[PDB]
Amino acid sequence: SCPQNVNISGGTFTLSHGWAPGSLLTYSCPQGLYPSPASRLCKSSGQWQTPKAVCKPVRCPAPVSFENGIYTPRLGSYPVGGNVSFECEDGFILRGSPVRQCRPNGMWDGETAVCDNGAGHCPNPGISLGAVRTGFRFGHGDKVRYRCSSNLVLTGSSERECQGNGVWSGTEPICRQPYSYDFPEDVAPALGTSFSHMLGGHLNLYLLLDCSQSVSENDFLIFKESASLMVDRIFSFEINVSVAIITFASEPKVLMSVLNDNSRDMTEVISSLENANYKDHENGTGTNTYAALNSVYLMMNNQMRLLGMETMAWQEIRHAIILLTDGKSNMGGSPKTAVDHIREILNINQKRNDYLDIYAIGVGKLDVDWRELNELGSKKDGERHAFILQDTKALHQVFEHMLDVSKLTDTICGVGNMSANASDQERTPWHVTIKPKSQETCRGALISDQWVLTAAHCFRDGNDHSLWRVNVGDPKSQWGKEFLIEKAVISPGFDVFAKKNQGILEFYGDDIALLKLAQKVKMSTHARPICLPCTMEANLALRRPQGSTCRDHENELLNKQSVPAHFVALNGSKLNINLKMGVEWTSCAEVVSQEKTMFPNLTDVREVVTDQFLCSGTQEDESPCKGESGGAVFLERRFRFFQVGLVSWGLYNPCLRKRAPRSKVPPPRDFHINLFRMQPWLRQHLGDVLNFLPL
Amino acid sequence: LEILQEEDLIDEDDIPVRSFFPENWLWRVETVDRFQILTLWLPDSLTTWEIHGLSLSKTKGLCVATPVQLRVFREFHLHLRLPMSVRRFEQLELRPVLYNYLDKNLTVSVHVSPVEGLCLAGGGGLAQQVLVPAGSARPVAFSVVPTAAAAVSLKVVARGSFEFPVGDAVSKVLQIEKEGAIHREELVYELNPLDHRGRTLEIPGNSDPNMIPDGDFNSYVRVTASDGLNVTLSSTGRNGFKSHALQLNNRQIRGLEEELQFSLGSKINVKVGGNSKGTLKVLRTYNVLDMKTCQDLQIEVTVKGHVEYTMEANEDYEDYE
Amino acid sequence: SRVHYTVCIWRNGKVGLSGMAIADVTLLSGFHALRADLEKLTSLSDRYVSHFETEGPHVLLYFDSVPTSRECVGFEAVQEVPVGLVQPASATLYDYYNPERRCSVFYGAPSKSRLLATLCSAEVCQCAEGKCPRQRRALERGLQDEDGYRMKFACYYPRVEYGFQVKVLREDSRAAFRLFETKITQVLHFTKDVKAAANQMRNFLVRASCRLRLEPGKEYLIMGLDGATYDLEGHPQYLLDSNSWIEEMPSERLCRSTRQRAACAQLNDFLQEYGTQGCQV
Amino acid sequence: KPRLLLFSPSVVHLGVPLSVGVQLQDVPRGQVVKGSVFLRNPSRNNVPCSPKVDFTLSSERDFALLSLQVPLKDAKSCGLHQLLRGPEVQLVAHSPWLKDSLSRTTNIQGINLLFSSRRGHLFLQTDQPIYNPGQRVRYRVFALDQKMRPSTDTITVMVENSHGLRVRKKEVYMPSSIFQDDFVIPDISEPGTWKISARFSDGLESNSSTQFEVKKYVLPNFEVKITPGKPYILTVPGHLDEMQLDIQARYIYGKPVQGVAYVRFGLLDEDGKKTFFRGLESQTKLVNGQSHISLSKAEFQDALEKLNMGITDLQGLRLYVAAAIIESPGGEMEEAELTSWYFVSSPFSLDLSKTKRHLVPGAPFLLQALVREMSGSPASGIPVKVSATVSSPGSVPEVQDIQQNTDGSGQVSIPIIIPQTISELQLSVSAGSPHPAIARLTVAAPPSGGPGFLSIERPDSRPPRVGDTLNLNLRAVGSGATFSHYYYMILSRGQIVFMNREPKRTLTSVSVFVDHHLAPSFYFVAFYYHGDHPVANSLRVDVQAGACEGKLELSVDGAKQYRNGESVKLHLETDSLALVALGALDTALYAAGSKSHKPLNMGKVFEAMNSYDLGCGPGGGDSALQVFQAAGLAFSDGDQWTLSRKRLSCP
Ligand SMILES: *[C@@H]1O[C@H](CO)[C@@H](O)[C@H](O)[C@H]1NC(C)=O
Ligand SMILES: *[C@@H]1O[C@H](CO)[C@@H](O)[C@H](O)[C@H]1NC(C)=O
Ligand SMILES: *[C@@H]1O[C@H](CO)[C@@H](O)[C@H](O)[C@H]1NC(C)=O
Ligand SMILES: [Mg+2]
């Protein structure tokens, strides 16, 4: 028999078939340590073959390069419990967590630290710890290539390109170790958010389970349990969804079909899943993942034939695929080819990318590789799709809290239609019209089912809100539906004549007002609130971790020195602006010293334009009119809309459907109240409505 | 016959690598209220840092301080100098040099961490054995053929014996340029906006048979203000339609020949204005296969005899498997 | 023990040069030049070198006259430690007046090659350096299969991502590799190269320095690691190294022999079970 | 008889105050004057480009300095932006007094001045002296006004590449007087010397620029320095000194390098064409990091015979030494060039710029010389022999021989006595023995029959310190004491700073307090009046030992022996709230650079003070107009006025 001197230092070991030849020895070490070697081979009664054994400590990737900054302390590879601080040079604003304590799983915590000056068209993608980047140009259409260092394996996008919409193609690469794994608590929010986007029409869901000899009967039972809870949850949301169950082996066997109408009923799908057994899989105990993906491909091309080439009923069909596999594809070829076929056949591109998400949940500890899960799963910015959990217990744990979406809170926001054939209101459902007693018209934005955020200057006649009216979008008529107002809260710091003693006729500081409607708005395709940043709602809309802060939302949404934004015109059309931040903000707002009517006695530019204002209007930018004041200044990220400001005042009014610029003194210039500088006031008057992040 | 020590060396895990090699640091500007202390972290590079210093105060004008020489020395290090130019698929020889300034004999194992994209000798896992006499230096040669086509992080390590616990590790990112050499394609067009025929001009697109895929196509325009051109370049491009307008004269004449980075794929157009005899030079750079051993000098070294390997570098059958 | 070097120099331009030249050869990893031989060289009237300096793996010679013809000199060195790894060294020649007019040569070991053996085809190369293919022989030697050694090599370590039984059509030598163009009898396993099928051509290349022999007209079972060379024709071209299983397929007469019936039959049993069913894991 | 004097700098700078001196003479005791002074346009139109400033004087107070302001808006509106040909402006004093007293046709008395928009001090420094292609470049500029106080005026920076084309331009405001900025060099940029320029937005001519070198290279590990035994080579036919070099090479971190040195000799001329010696190349093994080689007698003679060159013609050429040391066994290459070696006929050089010209007859001649070692530091204790030949005043010329050693830093002040009615004076200054340095100068004499003369005597020839009071003596020569006082003014940075009157006495003295801002060179100008003919003399005084108005001290705790990665407690000491700007530079950058760029130090700042000085020589002149022109002022007394200077250079 094999020799018994196979003890590991600081850990235990297990055997499959005793000391008989051909038995596999498994090495286990406590958390924060890794087995080395992981497993041994008893040979043909020979010496214990290995691909002295010691539980070497977990050691964690160190920053190979940190552009435009410094990092302390500097070490070859940080140990468990260690900390690293990332503060960088002047003129550069930090993103991500400045302090990262590396967890016992071989990963750091928080988003990767990088500071960008914003001059580049796209935000700085940064160098993830343990990785390198090639190409230091962030212009539109340029590319960056990432390469791991030492013995790390790359999970993520090995190549990212700066797209037109200001978001790099693919996910953020993260160099990982062969022995690193993921905690259920870390990955549950990622899965929850990604599925929330898959839900954001009818959705098609495919569940792929593993039943080879490598996966045990109990492990397959836990796979079945996790799939059943997942299916139970997806049907509890009352969404148009069909789920299919495929359990693959050396040859794939389909247990449920989406062609069959039966997939939309919970009892039937759970009964079909429970009828699965390991026995019907002993006829071939391989892992042919390409075969299962080809089965999905045949499934959807049958759906393609039966629905039609061009019919709307299929175009709104989104696909999400889950794989609960041990990542040991050993037959049928590379699984990536079938994913290539799927991408080719759904016509996936930079726009239809939302219609296809692949989740590659690996399970196990000894035959799990990273490359297959990374390649198989999809790669999208701000999300993670390739995971591994050491045990199936962890799989059940992460799934049972995977959709932890707070019950009855609701308050969705920032959902619109981006089709040109859609109506103006349906494209911008937050947009409302405000009628004060002065008979002049202003705009506003729905921030909830009851509250509207607008500009204070729109109400010059006083504070008698009972004579004011609002019109929100309404499906039944383009005129909208008129509501009365229960109460009005104008910012106490607002006074257009506060600075008259210094020769400034009109000062728009604190030009913000919150209006409560008499009746709750019925949510529909013409009436939805816009996500007010720096809350749980916008955080879920932005695909970000739970522990995000308000400064984080500033850094992310207002992430460039020139950030494109939008406002709604009088006729309902969406116009284009660019917000100037940082250094360019000062040059943007300096043209107020050349005004001739508003400020005849103006010696300090900061006195009329403060930090409370965003600045826009250069280039070919559109200039809002007086009637458009109070409307939301919003930006689009990740197919959701976010209000970073609203129109306050401008140095040129084009409306003095019709518009006209000019080319003399003064050049057009506009200022909008930056919502991020008013956070205390919205928190005072809105804390019991939205759930605000820590500042 | 020669005695070799195996696995009685340092564990290679405690040795602190050196990665931060900035040519300059401490670029910040500070506000000092007659006294300030700075806790600055020394970079790993082994040179002397000449700390400059300038003062600007609202009451005492300007003062420039005397530079402070600061020395960093380790007494035993693996100094490595990457070649100035490394090309993909082209063979280079990294030269890590071990300086032993102690008063004792030291025997050290030097190896390069195996990394994807680098073709080393024997897979990169084999460690070269060298001995550095006290108060002297010894070089060790590593041959590498990089095929990564991108920047790659190598980590050369020296491991002393457990009897004498010394060692150094260096990890500098090695950038590899794309295959082939660079080629410059300058196109000169005299610019007379007075002649109406010269008001518009079309530059032919580049179709170079020898241009290498991923050619790093960069176009820089060189327009001379010698006499008020308003030359504007509009161009349809694969990335998009970008147009940059150049006003060289700026109603002023002090050496205002201009040069701007101007990013296109294939096609470019010119709109002219003003009154001058300026010159436009669009510069195109791309990779190309071309060659040049010297044509003037040549050298060839032949070796004959028996050399002994360490039984881990013999590429032959084990004869028992 | 002792190795005889030979450093040779000459010039061809005859115009661009400025006269004298500087020799800078670096010995192997574990060699230092002998000062006695160098001083004997420099003591001769027609020494061809006016000065020298030698410490450890670095040898300096000052050539004051580089002629058109091949005129040169060699010296002897000794070994301190065994060469830790197989690799070519470099010898450089500088110009005395214009050192930037320098240009190096790479010289190999006494028996090894000049440059790092790498397999380039199309616009990619794979690092060909490594270990010799074993050419496993169990049936011909008569050793019975133990614990399914071939299956164990296929499924546990090194896991095999390509496996075919190939009939070697021809043997050729290209660059530093000996190419064995072959025809696919059957495809047991495959990860990449989805267009693998029988009666198809594949190029299998091994470094010429090794002694591995694939006799034409005979079938072998080939398994191992996948390569990314693409053969410049479209079909992936594989390289034979370590982690690659090479076995000779049974013939009409060697499997007939007595100590070989069980071994050959077990090998075909493996062939059918692995081609048809799979790793079973 | 009564007169009004107008004093102003010959060049007026826009946007900064202009100082105008005004003086009366032969004014009745009870009489008073009233008026205003301002600039105008140069006959194009008669709009005042400056707000009027009043000046009221009487007999007891007959002098006053007026801080006249010249705002940019008035200068633009009145038309200094619209002249033709050269820049010129008119400064005029208006008062009803001329018509009332002198019965002059006009109440206008003025001067012709040249207006220039250069103003303020602009300094800027880059990240490194030398960069690789494709590397990020950081830099910053500092904006200071005339008094180097921080300034908030807007500036526009620009970047010019190696060929000289603009690559960048940034128009930036100054909240903090410091503007940091970075840009990336193109990857395909060939080696060259780039340039960064910074100008004030409204100041067209106020361009200050620095240069950084771009070159393909890699960071060297060690540097080689060739230090000659003596920085001069004596080529006199009598003998030739030995030539020996000490080639040193050290690892930058301190230790010496073990290797070999390859040395190539040659003759390099002024133009730059170098002809090497075929043969005589020296190769040696470095011992203790140093190699001491020398050129023999017969070897060098044979080299010149091979080049068919003689010793006598070796004048102005240089012995070029090039070294290319190979580190062994490292194999690294490093090159060091020597080009400072000069073949000279004397080991000393005489600088006779400081000796004042056109000195007065009847007062001591102050001959000042600078005995500087040829291509070295100033020499001390080196005797100077000087022969003065006073040319025929009516009698035979006489020879005056004075000897005096240099007191220190090459300073020698030899006060030879000049007799009256001297026609002209010839001087022969010779310093050094043997092989002296010969310098000959000739000075004429003021025309005979002049209205008078003024002599300035400086008892202490040593340069004044900062904050050190300087006292001068003034003596009228060759005329009666009709006048009662004389008037003097102090010029620093091209502006009149001080004006005062001292009564006429015997062996008088005037004390000038050397303030810091007067450094490093201020003009003392003095004049009196003999009837209606002004006579003046202006002595130039240089202040050395310059130091900051404040102070900035950098210090590192403990000895300068650290190990990589540990902490440094850098110490910053100053005397006020300062925007201290720091920078850490690797020393290897200096070695890798082909030309060693000296870092910014107080020499350049103090030269920046001198860049605004309009002085023309060490002062002095035959006439009052010449003295005033050399000092850099414009004088109008109503009858005779100095013309505007032809050029700023004053050749
Ligand atoms: C080091 O090696 C040298 C050369 O072999 C030898 O002479 C010396 O004794 C050794 N030991 C020390 C401490 O220098
Ligand atoms: C160039 O364009 C400017 C734009 O302001 C225009 O005013 C000018 O006339 C143009 N230049 C010439 C020489 O016409
Ligand atoms: C300013 O620019 C002029 C014109 O190019 C140049 O001659 C002069 O030297 C510059 N002044 C400086 C560098 O101080
Ligand atoms: Mg399996």
GROMACS .gro file of N, CA, C and O in nm, chain C residues 137-180:
model
  176
 1153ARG      N    1   0.670   0.325  -2.412
 1153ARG     CA    2   0.666   0.192  -2.472
 1153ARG      C    3   0.636   0.092  -2.360
 1153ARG      O    4   0.724   0.057  -2.282
 1154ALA      N    5   0.511   0.046  -2.354
 1154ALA     CA    6   0.469  -0.053  -2.256
 1154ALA      C    7   0.431  -0.186  -2.321
 1154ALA      O    8   0.469  -0.292  -2.271
 1155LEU      N    9   0.358  -0.182  -2.432
 1155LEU     CA   10   0.319  -0.305  -2.499
 1155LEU      C   11   0.439  -0.374  -2.564
 1155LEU      O   12   0.452  -0.497  -2.555
 1156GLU      N   13   0.527  -0.297  -2.627
 1156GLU     CA   14   0.641  -0.358  -2.696
 1156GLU      C   15   0.740  -0.416  -2.596
 1156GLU      O   16   0.802  -0.519  -2.621
 1157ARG      N   17   0.757  -0.350  -2.481
 1157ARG     CA   18   0.843  -0.404  -2.376
 1157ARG      C   19   0.779  -0.523  -2.307
 1157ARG      O   20   0.850  -0.608  -2.253
 1158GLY      N   21   0.646  -0.533  -2.309
 1158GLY     CA   22   0.575  -0.642  -2.245
 1158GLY      C   23   0.520  -0.611  -2.108
 1158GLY      O   24   0.462  -0.700  -2.045
 1159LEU      N   25   0.535  -0.488  -2.060
 1159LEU     CA   26   0.483  -0.450  -1.929
 1159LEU      C   27   0.332  -0.432  -1.937
 1159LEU      O   28   0.283  -0.356  -2.021
 1160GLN      N   29   0.260  -0.503  -1.851
 1160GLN     CA   30   0.115  -0.491  -1.848
 1160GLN      C   31   0.072  -0.353  -1.798
 1160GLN      O   32   0.144  -0.287  -1.722
 1161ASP      N   33  -0.044  -0.309  -1.845
 1161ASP     CA   34  -0.096  -0.179  -1.804
 1161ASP      C   35  -0.135  -0.183  -1.657
 1161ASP      O   36  -0.206  -0.275  -1.613
 1162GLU      N   37  -0.091  -0.083  -1.582
 1162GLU     CA   38  -0.114  -0.076  -1.438
 1162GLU      C   39  -0.200   0.047  -1.407
 1162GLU      O   40  -0.167   0.158  -1.448
 1163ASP      N   41  -0.311   0.024  -1.337
 1163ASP     CA   42  -0.401   0.131  -1.292
 1163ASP      C   43  -0.450   0.217  -1.409
 1163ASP      O   44  -0.490   0.332  -1.389
 1164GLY      N   45  -0.449   0.163  -1.530
 1164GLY     CA   46  -0.483   0.241  -1.647
 1164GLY      C   47  -0.391   0.361  -1.662
 1164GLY      O   48  -0.436   0.475  -1.650
 1165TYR      N   49  -0.262   0.335  -1.685
 1165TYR     CA   50  -0.164   0.444  -1.687
 1165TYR      C   51  -0.199   0.546  -1.795
 1165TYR      O   52  -0.187   0.668  -1.773
 1166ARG      N   53  -0.243   0.500  -1.912
 1166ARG     CA   54  -0.282   0.591  -2.018
 1166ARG      C   55  -0.407   0.671  -1.979
 1166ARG      O   56  -0.413   0.793  -2.000
 1167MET      N   57  -0.507   0.604  -1.921
 1167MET     CA   58  -0.627   0.674  -1.877
 1167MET      C   59  -0.594   0.772  -1.766
 1167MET      O   60  -0.647   0.884  -1.763
 1168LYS      N   61  -0.507   0.732  -1.673
 1168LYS     CA   62  -0.466   0.819  -1.564
 1168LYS      C   63  -0.394   0.942  -1.617
 1168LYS      O   64  -0.417   1.054  -1.569
 1169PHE      N   65  -0.305   0.924  -1.715
 1169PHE     CA   66  -0.239   1.037  -1.778
 1169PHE      C   67  -0.339   1.127  -1.849
 1169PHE      O   68  -0.325   1.249  -1.850
 1170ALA      N   69  -0.442   1.067  -1.910
 1170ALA     CA   70  -0.541   1.144  -1.982
 1170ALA      C   71  -0.627   1.229  -1.889
 1170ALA      O   72  -0.654   1.346  -1.917
 1171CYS      N   73  -0.670   1.171  -1.777
 1171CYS     CA   74  -0.777   1.229  -1.698
 1171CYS      C   75  -0.730   1.305  -1.575
 1171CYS      O   76  -0.794   1.403  -1.537
 1172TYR      N   77  -0.621   1.262  -1.510
 1172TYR     CA   78  -0.578   1.328  -1.387
 1172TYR      C   79  -0.472   1.434  -1.414
 1172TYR      O   80  -0.495   1.553  -1.392
 1173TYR      N   81  -0.355   1.393  -1.463
 1173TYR     CA   82  -0.244   1.487  -1.475
 1173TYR      C   83  -0.137   1.424  -1.564
 1173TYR      O   84  -0.096   1.310  -1.540
 1174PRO      N   85  -0.089   1.495  -1.667
 1174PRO     CA   86  -0.142   1.622  -1.719
 1174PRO      C   87  -0.271   1.598  -1.796
 1174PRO      O   88  -0.272   1.517  -1.887
 1175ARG      N   89  -0.380   1.666  -1.761
 1175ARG     CA   90  -0.505   1.646  -1.832
 1175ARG      C   91  -0.486   1.675  -1.981
 1175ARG      O   92  -0.424   1.775  -2.018
 1176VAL      N   93  -0.536   1.585  -2.065
 1176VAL     CA   94  -0.512   1.589  -2.208
 1176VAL      C   95  -0.629   1.659  -2.275
 1176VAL      O   96  -0.745   1.621  -2.255
 1177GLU      N   97  -0.600   1.763  -2.354
 1177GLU     CA   98  -0.703   1.835  -2.427
 1177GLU      C   99  -0.708   1.799  -2.575
 1177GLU      O  100  -0.799   1.847  -2.645
 1178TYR      N  101  -0.615   1.719  -2.626
 1178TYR     CA  102  -0.626   1.670  -2.763
 1178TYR      C  103  -0.572   1.528  -2.768
 1178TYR      O  104  -0.465   1.499  -2.715
 1179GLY      N  105  -0.647   1.439  -2.832
 1179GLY     CA  106  -0.600   1.303  -2.852
 1179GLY      C  107  -0.646   1.244  -2.983
 1179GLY      O  108  -0.766   1.236  -3.011
 1180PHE      N  109  -0.550   1.200  -3.065
 1180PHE     CA  110  -0.579   1.135  -3.192
 1180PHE      C  111  -0.487   1.015  -3.208
 1180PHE      O  112  -0.376   1.013  -3.155
 1181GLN      N  113  -0.533   0.916  -3.283
 1181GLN     CA  114  -0.446   0.811  -3.334
 1181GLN      C  115  -0.407   0.851  -3.475
 1181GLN      O  116  -0.494   0.869  -3.561
 1182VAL      N  117  -0.277   0.867  -3.499
 1182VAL     CA  118  -0.228   0.926  -3.623
 1182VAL      C  119  -0.137   0.827  -3.694
 1182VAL      O  120  -0.060   0.754  -3.631
 1183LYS      N  121  -0.151   0.820  -3.826
 1183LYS     CA  122  -0.063   0.741  -3.912
 1183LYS      C  123   0.035   0.836  -3.978
 1183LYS      O  124  -0.004   0.918  -4.062
 1184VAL      N  125   0.163   0.824  -3.942
 1184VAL     CA  126   0.262   0.923  -3.982
 1184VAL      C  127   0.291   0.906  -4.131
 1184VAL      O  128   0.340   0.801  -4.175
 1185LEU      N  129   0.258   1.009  -4.209
 1185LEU     CA  130   0.280   1.003  -4.353
 1185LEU      C  131   0.427   1.023  -4.390
 1185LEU      O  132   0.480   0.951  -4.475
 1186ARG      N  133   0.494   1.119  -4.327
 1186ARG     CA  134   0.628   1.156  -4.369
 1186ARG      C  135   0.704   1.218  -4.253
 1186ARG      O  136   0.645   1.266  -4.156
 1187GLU      N  137   0.836   1.218  -4.265
 1187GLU     CA  138   0.926   1.283  -4.170
 1187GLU      C  139   1.008   1.387  -4.246
 1187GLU      O  140   1.065   1.356  -4.351
 1188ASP      N  141   1.011   1.509  -4.194
 1188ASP     CA  142   1.086   1.618  -4.254
 1188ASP      C  143   1.147   1.702  -4.144
 1188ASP      O  144   1.112   1.689  -4.027
 1189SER      N  145   1.242   1.787  -4.181
 1189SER     CA  146   1.307   1.879  -4.088
 1189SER      C  147   1.288   2.022  -4.139
 1189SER      O  148   1.329   2.054  -4.250
 1190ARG      N  149   1.225   2.106  -4.057
 1190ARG     CA  150   1.210   2.248  -4.086
 1190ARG      C  151   1.260   2.328  -3.967
 1190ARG      O  152   1.211   2.310  -3.855
 1191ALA      N  153   1.355   2.417  -3.992
 1191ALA     CA  154   1.417   2.502  -3.889
 1191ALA      C  155   1.470   2.411  -3.779
 1191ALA      O  156   1.545   2.317  -3.809
 1192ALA      N  157   1.436   2.435  -3.652
 1192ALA     CA  158   1.488   2.356  -3.542
 1192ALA      C  159   1.397   2.241  -3.502
 1192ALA      O  160   1.424   2.176  -3.401
 1193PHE      N  161   1.290   2.216  -3.577
 1193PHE     CA  162   1.198   2.108  -3.546
 1193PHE      C  163   1.191   2.009  -3.661
 1193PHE      O  164   1.207   2.045  -3.777
 1194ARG      N  165   1.168   1.883  -3.626
 1194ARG     CA  166   1.146   1.777  -3.723
 1194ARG      C  167   0.996   1.753  -3.734
 1194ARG      O  168   0.934   1.702  -3.640
 1195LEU      N  169   0.939   1.790  -3.848
 1195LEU     CA  170   0.795   1.781  -3.872
 1195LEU      C  171   0.757   1.640  -3.915
 1195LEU      O  172   0.820   1.583  -4.004
 1196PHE      N  173   0.655   1.585  -3.851
 1196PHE     CA  174   0.596   1.457  -3.890
 1196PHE      C  175   0.454   1.484  -3.937
 1196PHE      O  176   0.359   1.482  -3.858
   0.00000   0.00000   0.00000
